[PDB]
Design a protein around this ligand. Structure first.
Ligand SMILES: [Mg+2]
Length: 741
């Protein structure tokens, strides 16, 4: 049992290395430390100062350089005794302050221990290197072990969920969130891997379930400045099981796909992987049939100045993507058409519009246009017309308009985005068709989506994601509450989300989205109309809203994670996501078999119509409805720094996430009552020697406990006798630790 074999990789890689002795005496020390900011020239930078003295109200400690500073006891961040360095649950800490929390994480991280619990959460720090803890052999050690039984790990939480499902006959959910680059996806893949193995039918299905996300990754992921393999869409994976506990199917729901990246990427970034895959991977012959060239030959791929990802073979990935498609069940025909769509898009991006003639646009060279038309199988003349001379309803009149180059170009861009988003939607639907069962008994759903987003520039998509996150954090809050109450009950012992939530999705009075939708009805409304309406209703009138001192195009929202300033540019457009009807018409007649679906299947071609905001709101409520029916599990992924480097855990970077994702707040909350709770025998096992009476392995554990306690003359208010554990208040246990044997 690797778990008992101190020489195993299990031990090497997932546990704090255990020496020969276990004895208390070992960790003994006179020295008492404190966590201090060597400079409020920082406030997450801290050093450990040793307390060299104290007064009845404040401590005095040395600093690193040797300077004596003074602290208020009620302001000191006491450092936990060394025995606590490396515990598996932060709930085990006596002193639960910020620096102390970060320090435990860090000690663990320094030993490549990327997983640590914090009460209800599993906290996972990206190591930025591959630790060999996800082998089948690692899978097997986790089978059926309780939380307290094995080291912290994503496999552990997944096991706890599967057992819960089976035992309570209740659906479950794993919510995996945090910043881009944090490892959400990485961990989500490990959750699927695990389940397919502890519950798979020793199979085609399973293989298809696994080969499903590589298809989605090719189409939904891209290299950004924060992750070479960034998920540009959010997802909820339902893993379906029969009553016997075997995987029976699966379903995927995608959200917020970044269609905009198709037509533009920042410097060093890449467009979606598939473009590159096709281009590299296609057969000399397929190129000719697709009018394919190098990435440099395509405006949609030649602008950022990055057409390749280090250590990534686009050609080899193509092979992998195609294989996946093969496995899921995409027909070769279907696959051609999918590639055709990718090709056509590339062609659409290469169309050059010119003016002069007048104020109107024209197409002097039509190579590009013709290229896209062939691959899509639509009429280039019809296409051309729909591009620059769409017919617009001027009341009763249906007249064609001659668009300028700009307008012309943007329209082109909107056609590309709709084709991309619809394909994505169709691929998701194709895959669900295969995997998905109408006959499911139970499910474990996996949400891999970003946590709060607070960028230099915040736009509509950030408000959306942040809106979701206010809901998820309020859901965890409710959940912590119940579970916390429950514990207390079982042992015999003793917000604000709404307001932000309402400001965003409120109907009466109307909140942001409501107002946005309203403006959305008027063809002539502008960003200015919009921001002015927002300020009118909320500036100085809604406590979670802020009108900027000078910006005219932004507004701020006080979120759970702090204020977020948003820019209103293009919100109206984004809310309607328009596409010229004539473009719809052109493509509706497409001779292509996949293309026809994207335009003729109301379920793909249309939202409902309702606005983008209204759809986001409805989809978020459905998700939450689901979640509400599960027993949830929370994974908080954390990026150690902004450089994608191993062995470089940056305090400021880390602390900031801990503050935003709910970890430190929950600790704050916890720390207030009886954060430490220990199994009677566990307690004696360790502190027997502290009392002149007590046998290490006593049968009357509680007594034994009271014993020690009494010996020590500890203050009764600081502890609580529970039915199976001894409940301790903050710092009590550390002092205890600090006791002479
Ligand atoms: Mg991801």
């Amino acid at each position: 049992n690797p778990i008992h074999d101190r020489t195993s990789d299990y031990h090497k890689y997932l546990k704090v290395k255990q020496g020969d002795s276990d004895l208390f005496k070992l960790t003994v020390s006179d020295k008492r430390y404190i966590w201090y900011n060597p400079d409020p020239k920082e406030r997450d930078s801290y050093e450990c100062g040793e307390i060299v003295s104290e007064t009845s109200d404040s401590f005095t400690f040395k600093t690193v350089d040797g300077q004596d500073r003074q602290v208020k006891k009620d302001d000191a961040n006491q450092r936990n005794p060394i025995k606590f360095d490396g515990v598996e649950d932060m709930s085990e800490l006596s002193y639960l302050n910020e620096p102390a929390v970060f320090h435990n994480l860090r000690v663990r991280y320094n030993q490549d221990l990327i997983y640590t619990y914090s009460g209800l959460f599993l906290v996972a720090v990206n190591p930025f290197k591959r630790i060999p803890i996800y082998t089948q052999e690692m899978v097997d050690i986790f089978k059926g072990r309780r939380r307290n039984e094995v080291a912290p790990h994503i496999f552990a939480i997944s096991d706890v969920a599967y057992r819960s499902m089976l035992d309570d006959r209740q659906n479950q959910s794993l919510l995996i969130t945090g910043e881009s680059g944090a490892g959400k996806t990485e961990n989500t893949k490990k959750v699927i891997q695990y389940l397919a193995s502890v519950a798979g039918r020793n199979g085609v299905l399973e293989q298809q379930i696994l080969q499903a996300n590589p298809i989605l990754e090719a189409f939904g992921n891209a290299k950004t400045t924060r992750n070479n393999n960034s998920s540009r869409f959010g997802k909820f994976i339902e893993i379906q099981f029969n009553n016997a506990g075997f995987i029976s199917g699966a379903s995927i729901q995608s959200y917020l796909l970044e269609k905009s990246r198709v037509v533009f990427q920042s410097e060093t970034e890449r467009n979606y992987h598939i473009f590159y895959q096709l281009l590299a991977g296609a057969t000399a012959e397929e190129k000719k049939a697709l009018h394919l060239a190098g990435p440099e030959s395509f405006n949609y791929l030649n602008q950022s100045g990055c057409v390749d990802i280090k250590g990534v073979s686009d050609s080899e990935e193509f092979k992998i993507t195609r294989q996946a498609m093969d496995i899921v069940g995409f027909s070769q025909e279907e696959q051609m058409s999918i590639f055709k769509i990718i090709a056509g898009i590339l062609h659409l991006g290469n169309i050059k519009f010119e003016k002069g003639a007048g104020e109107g646009a024209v197409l002097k060279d039509k190579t590009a246009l013709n290229a896209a038309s062939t691959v899509f199988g639509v009429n280039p003349s019809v296409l051309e017309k729909a591009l620059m001379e769409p017919r617009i309803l001027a009341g009763r009149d249906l007249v064609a308009q001659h668009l300028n180059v700009e307008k012309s170009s943007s329209s082109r861009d909107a056609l590309v985005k709709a084709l991309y988003g619809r394909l994505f939607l169709w691929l998701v639907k194709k895959i669900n068709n295969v995997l998905c069962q109408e006959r499911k008994a139970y499910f474990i759903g996996v949400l891999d989506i970003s946590g709060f987003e607070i960028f230099k520039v915040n736009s509509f998509e950030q408000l959306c994601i942040n809106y979701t996150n206010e809901k998820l954090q309020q859901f965890f809050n409710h959940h912590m509450f119940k579970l916390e109450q429950e514990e207390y009950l079982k042992e015999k012992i003793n917000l604000d989300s709404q307001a932000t939530i309402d400001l965003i999705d409120g109907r009466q009075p109307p909140g942001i989205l409501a107002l946005l939708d309203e403006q959305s009805v008027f063809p002539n409304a502008t960003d200015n109309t919009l921001i002015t309406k927002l300020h009118s209703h909320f500036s100085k009138k809604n406590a979670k809203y802020e009108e900027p001192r000078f910006s005219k195009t932004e507004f701020g929202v006080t979120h759970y994670a702090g204020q977020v300033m948003y820019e209103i540019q293009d919100w109206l457009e984004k809310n309607k996501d328009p596409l010229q009807q004539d473009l719809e018409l052109c493509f509706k007649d497409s001779s292509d078999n996949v293309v026809t679906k994207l335009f003729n299947d109301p379920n793909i071609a249309s939202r409902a119509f309702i606005t983008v905001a209204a759809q986001y709101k409805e989809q978020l409520a459905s998700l939450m409805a689901t979640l509400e029916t599960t027993n949830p599990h929370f994974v908080r992924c954390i990026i150690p720094n902004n450089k994608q480097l191993p062995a470089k855990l940056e305090d400021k970077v880390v602390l900031d996430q801990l503050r935003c994702n709910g970890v430190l707040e929950g600790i704050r909350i916890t720390r207030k009552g009886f954060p430490n709770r220990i199994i009677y025998a566990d307690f004696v096992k360790r502190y027997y020697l502290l009392a002149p009476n007590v046998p290490r392995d006593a049968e009357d554990s509680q007594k034994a406990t009271d014993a020690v306690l009494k010996h020590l003359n500890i203050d009764p208010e600081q502890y609580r006798f529970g039915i199976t554990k001894i409940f301790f208040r903050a710092g009590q246990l550390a002092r205890i630790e600090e006791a002479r044997e």
